[PDB]
Design an enzyme around this catalytic site. Structure first.
Site, PDB file in Angstrom:
ATOM      1  N   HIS F 202       0.796  -1.218   0.000  1.00 31.24           N
ATOM      2  CA  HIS F 202       0.000   0.000   0.000  1.00 31.24           C
ATOM      3  C   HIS F 202       0.832   1.273   0.000  1.00 31.24           C
ATOM      4  O   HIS F 202       0.327   2.325  -0.392  1.00 31.24           O
ATOM      5  CB  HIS F 202      -0.907  -0.016   1.217  1.00 31.24           C
ATOM      6  CG  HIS F 202      -1.884   1.103   1.257  1.00 31.24           C
ATOM      7  ND1 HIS F 202      -2.936   1.199   0.378  1.00 31.24           N
ATOM      8  CD2 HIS F 202      -1.959   2.187   2.060  1.00 31.24           C
ATOM      9  CE1 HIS F 202      -3.626   2.291   0.645  1.00 31.24           C
ATOM     10  NE2 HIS F 202      -3.055   2.908   1.662  1.00 31.24           N
ATOM     11  N   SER F 206       0.595  -1.005  -6.738  1.00 35.00           N
ATOM     12  CA  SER F 206       0.985  -2.090  -7.613  1.00 35.00           C
ATOM     13  C   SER F 206       1.797  -1.560  -8.780  1.00 35.00           C
ATOM     14  O   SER F 206       1.743  -0.381  -9.120  1.00 35.00           O
ATOM     15  CB  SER F 206      -0.245  -2.821  -8.133  1.00 35.00           C
ATOM     16  OG  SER F 206      -0.970  -3.410  -7.075  1.00 35.00           O
ATOM     17  N   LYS F 228     -13.470  -7.279 -11.992  1.00 31.21           N
ATOM     18  CA  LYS F 228     -12.396  -7.985 -12.677  1.00 31.21           C
ATOM     19  C   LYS F 228     -11.768  -9.054 -11.787  1.00 31.21           C
ATOM     20  O   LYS F 228     -11.245 -10.049 -12.292  1.00 31.21           O
ATOM     21  CB  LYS F 228     -11.360  -6.985 -13.170  1.00 31.21           C
ATOM     22  CG  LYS F 228     -10.336  -7.550 -14.099  1.00 31.21           C
ATOM     23  CD  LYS F 228      -9.333  -6.526 -14.507  1.00 31.21           C
ATOM     24  CE  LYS F 228      -8.302  -7.138 -15.401  1.00 31.21           C
ATOM     25  NZ  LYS F 228      -7.918  -6.221 -16.482  1.00 31.21           N
ATOM     26  N   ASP F 229     -11.840  -8.893 -10.466  1.00 25.87           N
ATOM     27  CA  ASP F 229     -11.462  -9.968  -9.565  1.00 25.87           C
ATOM     28  C   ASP F 229     -12.510 -11.057  -9.555  1.00 25.87           C
ATOM     29  O   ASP F 229     -12.173 -12.241  -9.494  1.00 25.87           O
ATOM     30  CB  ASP F 229     -11.277  -9.437  -8.148  1.00 25.87           C
ATOM     31  CG  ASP F 229      -9.954  -8.742  -7.950  1.00 25.87           C
ATOM     32  OD1 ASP F 229      -9.240  -8.526  -8.945  1.00 25.87           O
ATOM     33  OD2 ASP F 229      -9.648  -8.371  -6.800  1.00 25.87           O
ATOM     34  N   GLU F 272       4.155 -34.185  -1.874  1.00 17.41           N
ATOM     35  CA  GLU F 272       3.149 -33.671  -2.790  1.00 17.41           C
ATOM     36  C   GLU F 272       3.810 -32.951  -3.954  1.00 17.41           C
ATOM     37  O   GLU F 272       4.977 -32.572  -3.887  1.00 17.41           O
ATOM     38  CB  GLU F 272       2.197 -32.728  -2.077  1.00 17.41           C
ATOM     39  CG  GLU F 272       1.105 -33.418  -1.307  1.00 17.41           C
ATOM     40  CD  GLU F 272      -0.148 -33.671  -2.123  1.00 17.41           C
ATOM     41  OE1 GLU F 272      -0.067 -33.769  -3.362  1.00 17.41           O
ATOM     42  OE2 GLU F 272      -1.230 -33.767  -1.517  1.00 17.41           O
TER      43      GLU F 272
HETATM   44  C1  HEM Z   1      -2.274 -22.429   4.969  1.00 17.22           C
HETATM   45  C2  HEM Z   1      -3.324 -23.100   4.536  1.00 17.22           C
HETATM   46  C3  HEM Z   1      -3.367 -24.557   4.615  1.00 17.22           C
HETATM   47  C4  HEM Z   1      -2.763 -25.441   3.799  1.00 17.22           C
HETATM   48  C5  HEM Z   1      -1.893 -25.110   2.624  1.00 17.22           C
HETATM   49  C6  HEM Z   1      -3.107 -26.729   4.262  1.00 17.22           C
HETATM   50  C7  HEM Z   1      -2.636 -27.880   3.639  1.00 17.22           C
HETATM   51  C8  HEM Z   1      -3.066 -29.123   4.019  1.00 17.22           C
HETATM   52  C9  HEM Z   1      -2.839 -30.293   3.301  1.00 17.22           C
HETATM   53  C10 HEM Z   1      -2.090 -30.418   2.012  1.00 17.22           C
HETATM   54  C11 HEM Z   1      -3.413 -31.297   3.973  1.00 17.22           C
HETATM   55  C12 HEM Z   1      -3.403 -32.728   3.541  1.00 17.22           C
HETATM   56  C13 HEM Z   1      -4.701 -33.031   2.809  1.00 17.22           C
HETATM   57  C14 HEM Z   1      -4.607 -34.389   2.203  1.00 17.22           C
HETATM   58  O1  HEM Z   1      -3.615 -34.697   1.521  1.00 17.22           O
HETATM   59  O2  HEM Z   1      -5.527 -35.204   2.377  1.00 17.22           O
HETATM   60  C15 HEM Z   1      -4.002 -30.762   5.117  1.00 17.22           C
HETATM   61  C16 HEM Z   1      -4.667 -31.501   6.043  1.00 17.22           C
HETATM   62  C17 HEM Z   1      -5.352 -30.953   7.110  1.00 17.22           C
HETATM   63  N1  HEM Z   1      -5.449 -29.643   7.386  1.00 17.22           N
HETATM   64 FE1  HEM Z   1      -4.695 -28.244   6.416  1.00 17.22          FE
HETATM   65  N2  HEM Z   1      -3.901 -26.636   5.330  1.00 17.22           N
HETATM   66  C18 HEM Z   1      -4.105 -25.344   5.606  1.00 17.22           C
HETATM   67  C19 HEM Z   1      -4.849 -24.748   6.613  1.00 17.22           C
HETATM   68  C20 HEM Z   1      -5.449 -25.476   7.617  1.00 17.22           C
HETATM   69  C21 HEM Z   1      -5.980 -24.952   8.798  1.00 17.22           C
HETATM   70  C22 HEM Z   1      -5.998 -23.494   9.148  1.00 17.22           C
HETATM   71  C23 HEM Z   1      -6.475 -26.012   9.530  1.00 17.22           C
HETATM   72  C24 HEM Z   1      -7.126 -26.081  10.844  1.00 17.22           C
HETATM   73  C25 HEM Z   1      -8.003 -25.220  11.326  1.00 17.22           C
HETATM   74  C26 HEM Z   1      -6.210 -27.165   8.780  1.00 17.22           C
HETATM   75  C27 HEM Z   1      -6.571 -28.405   9.187  1.00 17.22           C
HETATM   76  C28 HEM Z   1      -6.189 -29.527   8.483  1.00 17.22           C
HETATM   77  C29 HEM Z   1      -6.607 -30.827   8.947  1.00 17.22           C
HETATM   78  C30 HEM Z   1      -7.451 -31.097  10.150  1.00 17.22           C
HETATM   79  C31 HEM Z   1      -6.112 -31.732   8.114  1.00 17.22           C
HETATM   80  C32 HEM Z   1      -6.369 -33.197   8.373  1.00 17.22           C
HETATM   81  C33 HEM Z   1      -6.336 -34.238   7.258  1.00 17.22           C
HETATM   82  C34 HEM Z   1      -7.371 -33.953   6.228  1.00 17.22           C
HETATM   83  O3  HEM Z   1      -8.559 -33.885   6.571  1.00 17.22           O
HETATM   84  O4  HEM Z   1      -7.044 -33.806   5.041  1.00 17.22           O
HETATM   85  N3  HEM Z   1      -5.590 -26.821   7.625  1.00 17.22           N
HETATM   86  N4  HEM Z   1      -3.783 -29.424   5.134  1.00 17.22           N
HETATM   87  C1  HEM Z   2      -0.648 -15.916   1.019  1.00 13.65           C
HETATM   88  C2  HEM Z   2      -0.163 -15.563  -0.155  1.00 13.65           C
HETATM   89  C3  HEM Z   2      -0.214 -14.223  -0.746  1.00 13.65           C
HETATM   90  C4  HEM Z   2      -1.194 -13.280  -0.762  1.00 13.65           C
HETATM   91  C5  HEM Z   2      -2.571 -13.271  -0.168  1.00 13.65           C
HETATM   92  C6  HEM Z   2      -0.693 -12.200  -1.495  1.00 13.65           C
HETATM   93  C7  HEM Z   2      -1.468 -11.072  -1.695  1.00 13.65           C
HETATM   94  C8  HEM Z   2      -1.092 -10.111  -2.586  1.00 13.65           C
HETATM   95  C9  HEM Z   2      -1.973  -9.186  -3.130  1.00 13.65           C
HETATM   96  C10 HEM Z   2      -3.430  -9.088  -2.790  1.00 13.65           C
HETATM   97  C11 HEM Z   2      -1.266  -8.420  -3.973  1.00 13.65           C
HETATM   98  C12 HEM Z   2      -1.802  -7.282  -4.781  1.00 13.65           C
HETATM   99  C13 HEM Z   2      -2.483  -7.745  -6.065  1.00 13.65           C
HETATM  100  C14 HEM Z   2      -1.436  -8.142  -7.048  1.00 13.65           C
HETATM  101  O1  HEM Z   2      -0.548  -7.326  -7.348  1.00 13.65           O
HETATM  102  O2  HEM Z   2      -1.450  -9.280  -7.553  1.00 13.65           O
HETATM  103  C15 HEM Z   2       0.057  -8.868  -3.958  1.00 13.65           C
HETATM  104  C16 HEM Z   2       1.073  -8.311  -4.681  1.00 13.65           C
HETATM  105  C17 HEM Z   2       2.334  -8.875  -4.661  1.00 13.65           C
HETATM  106  N1  HEM Z   2       2.740 -10.002  -4.083  1.00 13.65           N
HETATM  107 FE1  HEM Z   2       1.700 -11.131  -3.057  1.00 13.65          FE
HETATM  108  N2  HEM Z   2       0.536 -12.446  -1.924  1.00 13.65           N
HETATM  109  C18 HEM Z   2       0.903 -13.658  -1.513  1.00 13.65           C
HETATM  110  C19 HEM Z   2       2.099 -14.342  -1.701  1.00 13.65           C
HETATM  111  C20 HEM Z   2       3.187 -13.771  -2.325  1.00 13.65           C
HETATM  112  C21 HEM Z   2       4.384 -14.405  -2.628  1.00 13.65           C
HETATM  113  C22 HEM Z   2       4.670 -15.829  -2.262  1.00 13.65           C
HETATM  114  C23 HEM Z   2       5.187 -13.484  -3.278  1.00 13.65           C
HETATM  115  C24 HEM Z   2       6.543 -13.612  -3.824  1.00 13.65           C
HETATM  116  C25 HEM Z   2       7.581 -14.080  -3.157  1.00 13.65           C
HETATM  117  C26 HEM Z   2       4.440 -12.300  -3.382  1.00 13.65           C
HETATM  118  C27 HEM Z   2       4.897 -11.164  -3.967  1.00 13.65           C
HETATM  119  C28 HEM Z   2       4.036 -10.152  -4.343  1.00 13.65           C
HETATM  120  C29 HEM Z   2       4.508  -9.057  -5.163  1.00 13.65           C
HETATM  121  C30 HEM Z   2       5.908  -8.883  -5.656  1.00 13.65           C
HETATM  122  C31 HEM Z   2       3.456  -8.267  -5.354  1.00 13.65           C
HETATM  123  C32 HEM Z   2       3.417  -6.999  -6.128  1.00 13.65           C
HETATM  124  C33 HEM Z   2       3.125  -7.313  -7.573  1.00 13.65           C
HETATM  125  C34 HEM Z   2       2.946  -6.020  -8.285  1.00 13.65           C
HETATM  126  O3  HEM Z   2       1.943  -5.325  -8.061  1.00 13.65           O
HETATM  127  O4  HEM Z   2       3.807  -5.645  -9.092  1.00 13.65           O
HETATM  128  N3  HEM Z   2       3.229 -12.506  -2.815  1.00 13.65           N
HETATM  129  N4  HEM Z   2       0.148  -9.922  -3.099  1.00 13.65           N
END
Ligand code: HEM
Ligand code: HEM
Ligand SMILES: CCCCCCCCCCCCCCCCCC(=O)OC[C@H](COP(=O)([O-])OCC(O)COP(=O)([O-])OC[C@@H](COC(=O)CCCCCCCCCCCCCCCCC)OC(=O)CCCCCCCCCCCCCCCCC)OC(=O)CCCCCCCCCCCCCCCCC
Ligand SMILES: CCCCCCCCCCCCCCCCCC(=O)OC[C@H](COP(=O)([O-])OCC(O)COP(=O)([O-])OC[C@@H](COC(=O)CCCCCCCCCCCCCCCCC)OC(=O)CCCCCCCCCCCCCCCCC)OC(=O)CCCCCCCCCCCCCCCCC
Ligand SMILES: CCCCCCCCCCCCCCCC(=O)OC[C@H](COP(=O)([O-])OCC[N+](C)(C)C)OC(=O)CCCCCCCCCCCCCCC
Ligand SMILES: CCCCCCCCCCCCCCCC(=O)OC[C@H](COP(=O)(O)OCCN)OC(=O)CCCCCCCCCCCCCCC
Ligand SMILES: CCCCCCCCCCCCCCCC(=O)OC[C@H](COP(=O)(O)OCCN)OC(=O)CCCCCCCCCCCCCCC
Ligand SMILES: CCCCCCCCCCCCCCCC(=O)OC[C@H](COP(=O)(O)OCCN)OC(=O)CCCCCCCCCCCCCCC
Ligand code: HEC
Ligand code: HEM
Ligand code: HEM
EC number: 7.1.1.8
Lengths: 247, 385, 57, 126, 93, 385, 93
Positions: F202, F206, F228-229, F272
């Site tokens: 901010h 962008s 557009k989003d 994965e």
């Molecule tokens: C950052 C976002 C998250 C990612 C990327 C993520 C990723 C994953 C992945 C890849 C699995 C395995 C699923 C499978 O292969 O079957 C998993 C399982 C699980 N995640 Fe997450 N997770 C996220 C957020 C959360 C949060 C916030 C919670 C709890 C409030 C949660 C609860 C669980 C639970 C309970 C499982 C149990 C196995 C299943 O039901 O698949 N996750 N998560």
């Molecule tokens: C939880 C994951 C993320 C969220 C929610 C997030 C959110 C955002 C949002 C809402 C914007 C503004 C819209 C846009 O420009 O596309 C943005 C811009 C950006 N994000 Fe992320 N972001 C994430 C992960 C990342 C990662 C992993 C990177 C790179 C390492 C990254 C780098 C950037 C950059 C460089 C911009 C500016 C792009 C530009 O306007 O030129 N973000 N992000």
């Protein structure tokens, strides 16, 4: 509710661990384990106390190994899949006398004896309650009560009627250190042992509490000084108002 | 400009805790907020390190808590710290609210700050009720059943919302696993609401015990109020270390060391001590629907306070009747808390009804009448006619 | 020599926090040993090693 | 939240009564003495909450010397309360010195705002 | 960023109080002062002044509520005893 | 002024999503950030509604996951939505990072934005790994074993930290309960870091696909980029609904439906699909300490990027060699991911080593050389002497 | 709050671009326009223009890496066949 429904309150006996620098008498815990094993283990359980927690508190390593090996636990089944049994080790838990709750209620006339591994924290009064309950059984209930059959009078139990009869009698256990093992001595020893079983962290907790209370009191007073040193310039600030000339 | 101003994140940190202009007149009651921040960090960290060992099934909850106590290294420190720190969090939160309605902090520049505070209070009550329900003792289980069967009084959808809460038909394994997931979750909602509390505070700044404006001399928060907060931080840690290490099961009930048994009632079901006044409010009304409506009204009556305070000077520092009736309110709250721990016997139902009426008549009757009387006394004591 | 005490210990903040940490190290060690020895001598005849010496005598 | 025209209305009715004044003004004088703002060197019109537009216009319309004296009395009360002491008894405000000095400005601004909203909700007879 | 609404507290330079003139303030370095100055005098005399001014407001409602709780507790312990059973059976039934 | 500006919270909402001036020239690659925010909300909500039914012991993890799949209502929707939503989260995050690497979004004003993005990338890699480990299938046990056992190569402390990670002597009940508590925790840290990502964004706005300044014409975000989003929001929901309802197990591995067995190694242990390039980078170094250092350096090489970009023009829109070598880098990443799913066999280890060298020579050798060549070409193509 | 550092984007009114003179912009209400105008012309001619401009950059590295992957896959299939064991032993050790 009335005083009978509340139960009589236990008085404040002078335990050797009452007080913030004190410690369980470990000979009292060893004698109390003997009174538990010889009297209490017929009806009550000790489901949370492993064998390994007694090593170095009340008994020696081999002294616990032999007491564990005098029992029999469920082994992993053999190569034909038949069930097997095993002599106990230090990892196992102290086994109860009954296989389930229905065997317990059948053996003790409908009532279930509670597991004693948290009973001085589970009861209001604690060690005083357990001691005064075990030694509180009168020779006759007071004139007027109608005790149900199979139940005994004890005024410290709430309601009065308890399903445990009087279990502690004079010289029913002989101690290995030659202590005169009367009713009061045995009740003292089991209550010290049950208090250890409920709170096995008691000594270390009080020692660490000494350390934190000393460090935090010193930090509190020292921070009072540093606050007064920082705020000196604001507490000793002086304002003078000469009224400005009209313009 | 300085790097602590010319950053993005350090600008926020500087603006809130380093160069924040505080009124110089604020006393030691203005440390309860930083104390609640310390308490919240304590609860979150010790709860995470206990959730690393807690299992949430109904057959494993209680024994997992004792596995934390007996088998985990320094786990009794964690459990006793979490439980007594929750109770200390509520005592400090009661002091924060009592300061706020003593010194008139609820009033017209800060009504959104007061309302975000009331939302935070409701969320902390819910968090602690769920966390007490997770340990699954005897008071835990039966407390869960009476508080959830409160919601069966709604005459149309009450049975289905209580069967949706329970996850079944009474408090069992789905209810306990639900209550663990929610008892994790609601603290992070509380952290978001605390950030919003600070944002609503920061626009107008804090009050002062005089109730006059504090815009005239002000002090940056760093090197003055950082150390004045450090004094109370070390005092609070000292008193908490006392209760954790020398007296840990004092505030608790002994019946949470009996495992939860759906067939035996423990003959006096009471919640933890801080929910006793609202429990007595709920118990005083001879109806269940009006009982829960009156309990929620007893905590939503903190919102009528900026509209019933009818006086021109902020706070009770310079009023005698406001001071007197304020402490009548506070000891009414303490009597209500002690009535909530007693049985429903013969003087106590009348005492709880009269104390509930005094609790509601404070906000709705006493504060307007005393405010108007003090207004006209302040006028005619010094104008001549 | 208060000027020499200041010039060695409190003038540089590197040396200042270095002696803060050195003092915290040695304080933690000897404070631990002093509290354990006082606690054990206060509880004499009650700890396990006393009962072990009694049943070994 | 009780605007000063109502307070002045009730107070003028009390003070213009022979019975009500001789019963109520001693109670108000004891109330003022017990209140103890004078021991911190403050008059009562330094105590009124200033964060509404009525008091902001009244403080803006207050003359220069009165505003400087008010600012000094406020800063002195803050420094006194910072040390948890009082002022010395010669520095206390006396009863003749505790004058209502902001009250005409508050009453004028309140009558202006009341006439403003009554003329915003004006309705004609046609 | 956008500008937001008018508040009642600015920052260092534009706090929003009145104009100040003719007020001089003096203050000495704390490194040249004595902290813990007057603590034994303030501990006994200032604390007595603060107690004497602020104790009737605290200990008259405390006395009322403690006497109420004591009297109600005595009535309950009387009614659930043998001597006071007749009034219990007429006060509930 | 308007109430959406005069308020404390509504001005934050206004300043970020309503009146926020966006460059008018930005294309559909600028919807990936809003898409990642929607992905994070999806993951958090479905994770809470599955953790209301999940048990985290070593005995009950797998069967509680199938209790979610079989007898809780719409539980297959929740589990397939969580798993495929995590995979879609990583695909959209790779698109976000490759857009930022294409259009020069890492450059001179937005380096703090790039660094907070890299921190977010590390935290969600950790979250997805722990959540895979909570399923306790066969792939998750042996993936946990390999990745945790990689920390044994630290020469003095490595055995103590792997025993501290495990909570024991192999992956067991303490390890699974630890991993569940952390997989629940770290997404809230990700949400806080997303708020800091937006706060760093901010202050400068962008970028735009020209790379030139966008301060000249700008349109507000409301009713232009909101809709557009919404286009890509509904498109993403459609493609995710296809993968959840018609091919729910395509992006997974079939070995996770075998319950976890410490005694059977599944003869091809892969993580994965999105961790596969870093797995191939780790595998392609014939050492263990150098392997774990090279994988962590492969995630941390994205911070060297603002200092090795030696060109005066932001972005690759108007450069031809930079476009060519950018797509060489992208398909090198895809080949690295395909190599990480293959066995340790003869052509694949040389292919993995050469692709690792290309991955690291892009940021460190190719980008500076190509960008200074493009600078000199841009100069001498249009100045005459 | 205090003002923060100098940025490269202000707000509505003080964005921070250069001064603008002589640029006039015209626009019509969308309610008076035809949306989806020219979609069938842009779908075939503009799409081909954008594809013709930006496809060698994408499809030459894709061709290189896909040919490399297919060749390595064919060699791995040959090495673990009956016809190619006698190279596999002298290849691996
Ligand atoms: C950052 C976002 C998250 C990612 C990327 C993520 C990723 C994953 C992945 C890849 C699995 C395995 C699923 C499978 O292969 O079957 C998993 C399982 C699980 N995640 Fe997450 N997770 C996220 C957020 C959360 C949060 C916030 C919670 C709890 C409030 C949660 C609860 C669980 C639970 C309970 C499982 C149990 C196995 C299943 O039901 O698949 N996750 N998560
Ligand atoms: C939880 C994951 C993320 C969220 C929610 C997030 C959110 C955002 C949002 C809402 C914007 C503004 C819209 C846009 O420009 O596309 C943005 C811009 C950006 N994000 Fe992320 N972001 C994430 C992960 C990342 C990662 C992993 C990177 C790179 C390492 C990254 C780098 C950037 C950059 C460089 C911009 C500016 C792009 C530009 O306007 O030129 N973000 N992000
Ligand atoms: C001991 C009992 C204290 C009685 C003697 C104190 C002097 C006195 O009469 O004060 C009346 C005094 C009225 O004085 P005031 O200047 O009119 O009050 C202005 C402010 O209220 C108070 O403004 P302040 O900035 O002075 O507030 C500090 C105050 C209040 O400080 C706090 O409120 C901090 C509250 C606790 C913070 C840590 C929380 C820990 C969390 C768990 C809490 C569990 C409970 O603490 C003190 O009073 C320190 C002075 C104590 C002198 C002791 C003299 C003993 C005889 C020799 O009322 C109090 O001081 C109440 C505090 C008593 C608490 C101690 C117990
Ligand atoms: C098939 C290609 C036919 C159209 C064509 O020849 O385009 C060449 C065209 C030449 O690029 P350009 O127009 O010079 O570059 C403009 C930028 O691509 C940016 O142009 P843009 O973002 O305004 O165009 C949006 C583009 C690209 O839109 C996106 O990247 C959004 C992706 C949405 C992701 C939704 C969730 C993903 C879930 C996992 C998958 O989507 C389209 O190509 C629609 C036109 C049909 O290449 C593309 O349009 C890329 C299409 C990628 C699919
Ligand atoms: C009970 C009633 C006893 C009254 C005690 C008392 O009021 O002490 C008065 C002085 C306080 O001395 P002070 O607080 O340091 O004040 C310094 C200002 N002087 C005196 C130098 C001008 O007295 C003192 O210096 C007391 C210091 C000795 C007290 C030791 C702890 C007892
Ligand atoms: C260690 C060495 C670091 C680099 C050397 C150096 O310290 O650099 C010194 C810099 C330079 O600052 P300057 O004003 O001289 O800049 C002049 C530019 N021309 O000061 C700083 O970093 C600022 C330090 C601010 C400290 C704020 C502390 C915040 C505490 C809370 C943290 C967040 C908690 C959230 C929960
Ligand atoms: C939830 C929202 C809450 C909002 C309010 C939060 C405010 C924080 C309140 C908690 C107190 C934190 C104290 C930090 C002190 C500091 O870091 O001080 C930094 C000071 C700056 O010294 P100086 O610049 O004055 O040096 C003048 C000449 N240079 O170095 C010191 O003297 C170090 C003194 C030792 C401090 C040890 C503190 C240990 C804290 C333990 C408890 C932590 C919790
Ligand atoms: C129910 C609420 C009251 C009715 C609504 C109403 O009456 O809205 C009337 C108000 C007043 O609007 P104003 O700023 O024009 O007036 C200012 C002068 N009083 O608008 C609003 O609340 C603002 C709406 C905010 C829109 C953004 C919300 C984004 C959320 C994500
Ligand atoms: C044989 C049968 C025994 C023996 C030898 C002991 N106990 Fe006791 N006990 C027993 C029953 C059947 C009951 C239930 C009675 C009831 O009405 O609940 C009990 C009860 C206890 C209690 C709880 C009392 C209470 O809830 O307040 C404690 C504590 C207890 N028993 C302890 C105890 C100890 C220390 C013994 C030492 C030798 C002991 N019991 C013997 C059955 C039996
Ligand atoms: C808002 C702050 C919090 C409050 C007020 C709070 C309150 C409580 C209370 C009162 C208990 C019962 C203590 C007992 O009687 O044994 C409890 C238990 C528990 N809380 Fe919390 N809690 C908070 C934060 C957390 C968080 C964030 C977690 C999870 C990470 C957590 C995990 C637990 C666990 C696991 C128990 C289990 C029983 C025990 O170990 O005592 N708490 N909580
Ligand atoms: C998690 C709990 C809370 C935290 C962390 C918190 C934090 C704070 C902090 C740091 C302050 C500034 C310091 C102070 O004035 O004491 C503050 C002020 C305030 N809080 Fe809270 N608070 C909490 C709960 C509440 C509650 C429950 C209420 C009341 C309903 C409330 C109402 C207020 C008010 C009115 C103020 C301004 C007081 C004043 O400065 O005059 N807060 N809060």
């Amino acid at each position: 509710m009335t005083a009978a429904e509340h139960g009589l309150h236990a008085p404040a006996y002078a335990w050797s661990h009452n007080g913030p620098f004190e410690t369980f008498d470990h000979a009292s815990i060893r004698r109390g384990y003997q009174v538990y094993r010889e009297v209490c283990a017929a009806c009550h359980s000790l489901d949370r106390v492993a064998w390994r927690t007694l090593v170095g508190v009340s008994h020696t390593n081999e002294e616990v190994r032999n007491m564990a090996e005098e029992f029999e636990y469920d082994d992993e089944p053999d190569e034909q899949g038949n069930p097997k049994k095993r002599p106990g080790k230090l990892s196992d838990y102290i086994p109860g006398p009954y296989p389930n709750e229905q065997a317990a209620r059948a053996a003790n006339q409908g009532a279930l004896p509670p597991d004693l591994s948290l009973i001085v924290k589970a009861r209001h009064g604690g060690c005083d309650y357990i001691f005064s309950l075990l030694t509180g059984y009168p020779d006759e209930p007071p004139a007027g009560v109608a005790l149900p059959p199979g139940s005994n009078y004890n005024p410290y139990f709430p309601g009065g009627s308890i399903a445990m009869a009087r279990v502690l009698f004079d010289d029913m256990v002989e101690y290995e250190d030659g202590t005169p093992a009367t009713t009061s001595q045995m009740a003292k020893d089991v209550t010290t042992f049950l208090n250890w079983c409920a709170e096995p962290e008691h000594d270390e907790r009080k020692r660490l509490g000494l350390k934190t209370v000393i460090i935090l009191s010193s930090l509190y007073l020292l921070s009072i000084w540093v606050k007064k040193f920082k705020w000196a310039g604001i507490k000793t600030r002086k304002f003078v108002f000469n009224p400005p000339k009209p313009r | 400009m300085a790097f602590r101003k010319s950053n993005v994140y350090l600008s926020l940190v500087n603006s809130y805790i380093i160069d924040s202009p505080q009124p110089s007149s604020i006393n030691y009651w203005w440390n309860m907020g930083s104390l609640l921040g310390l308490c919240l960090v304590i609860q979150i960290v010790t709860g995470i390190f206990m959730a690393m060992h807690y299992s949430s099934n109904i057959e494993l909850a209680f024994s997992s808590v004792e596995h934390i106590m007996r088998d985990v290294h320094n786990g009794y420190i964690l459990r006793y710290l979490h439980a007594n720190g929750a109770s200390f969090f509520f005592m400090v939160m009661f002091m924060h609210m009592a300061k706020g309605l003593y010194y008139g902090s609820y009033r017209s520049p800060r009504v959104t700050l007061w309302n975000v505070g009331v939302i935070i209070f409701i969320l902390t009550i819910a968090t602690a009720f769920l966390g007490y329900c997770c340990v699954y003792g005897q008071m835990s289980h039966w407390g869960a059943t009476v508080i959830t069967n409160l919601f069966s009084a709604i005459p149309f959808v009450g049975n289905d919302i209580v069967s949706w809460l329970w996850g079944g038909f009474s408090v069992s394994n789905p209810t306990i696993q639900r209550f663990f997931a929610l008892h994790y979750l609601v603290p992070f909602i509380i952290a978001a609401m605390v950030i919003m509390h600070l944002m609503a505070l920061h626009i107008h700044g804090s009050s002062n015990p005089l109730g006059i404006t504090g815009n005239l001399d002000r002090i940056p928060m760093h090197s003055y109020f950082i150390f004045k907060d450090l004094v109370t931080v070390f005092l609070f840690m000292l008193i908490l270390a006392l209760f954790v290490f020398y007296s840990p099961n004092t505030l608790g009930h002994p019946d949470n060391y009996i495992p939860g048994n759906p067939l035996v009632t423990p003959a006096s079901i009471v919640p933890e001590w801080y929910l006793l006044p609202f429990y007595a409010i709920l118990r005083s009304i001879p109806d269940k629907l009006l009982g829960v409506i009156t309990m929620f009204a007893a905590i939503l009556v903190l919102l009528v306070l900026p509209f019933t305070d009818r006086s021109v000077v902020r706070g009770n520092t310079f009023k005698v009747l406001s001071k007197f009736f304020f402490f009548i309110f506070v000891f009414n709250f303490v009597l209500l808390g002690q009535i909530g721990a007693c049985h429903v016997e013969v003087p106590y139902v009348l005492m709880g009804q009269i104390a509930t009426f005094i609790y509601f008549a404070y906000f709705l009757i006493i504060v307007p009448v005393i405010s108007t009387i003090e207004n006209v006394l302040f006028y005619i004591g010094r104008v001549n006619k | 020599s208060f000027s020499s005490l200041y010039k060695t210990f409190f003038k540089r903040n590197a040396v200042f926090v270095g002696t803060i940490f050195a003092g915290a190290f040695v304080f933690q060690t000897v404070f631990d040993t002093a509290i354990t020895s006082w606690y054990e001598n206060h509880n004499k005849g009650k700890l396990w090693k006393d009962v072990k010496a009694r049943i070994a005598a | 939240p009780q605007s000063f025209t109502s307070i002045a209305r009730i107070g003028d009715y009390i003070l213009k009564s022979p019975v009500l004044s001789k019963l109520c003004v001693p109670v108000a004088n004891q109330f003022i003495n017990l209140a103890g703002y004078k021991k911190l060197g403050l008059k009562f019109d330094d105590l009124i909450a200033e964060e509404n537009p009525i008091m902001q216009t009244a403080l803006r319309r207050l003359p220069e010397d009165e505003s400087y004296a008010r600012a000094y009395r406020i800063i002195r009360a803050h420094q006194t309360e910072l040390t948890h002491h009082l002022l010395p008894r010669n520095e206390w405000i006396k009863a003749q010195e505790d004058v209502p000095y902001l009250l005409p400005y508050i009453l004028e601004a309140e009558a202006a705002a009341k006439e403003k909203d009554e003329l915003d909700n004006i309705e004609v007879s046609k | 960023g956008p500008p937001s609404g008018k508040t009642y507290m600015g920052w260092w330079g534009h706090m929003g109080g009145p104009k100040q003139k003719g007020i001089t303030s003096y203050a000495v370095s704390p490194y040249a002062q004595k902290p813990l100055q007057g603590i034994f005098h303030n501990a006994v005399f200032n604390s007595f002044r603060r107690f004497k001014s602020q104790f009737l407001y605290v200990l008259i409602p405390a006395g009322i509520y403690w006497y109420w709780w004591k009297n109600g507790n005595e009535y309950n312990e009387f009614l659930y005893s043998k001597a006071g059973r007749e009034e219990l059976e007429r006060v509930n039934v």
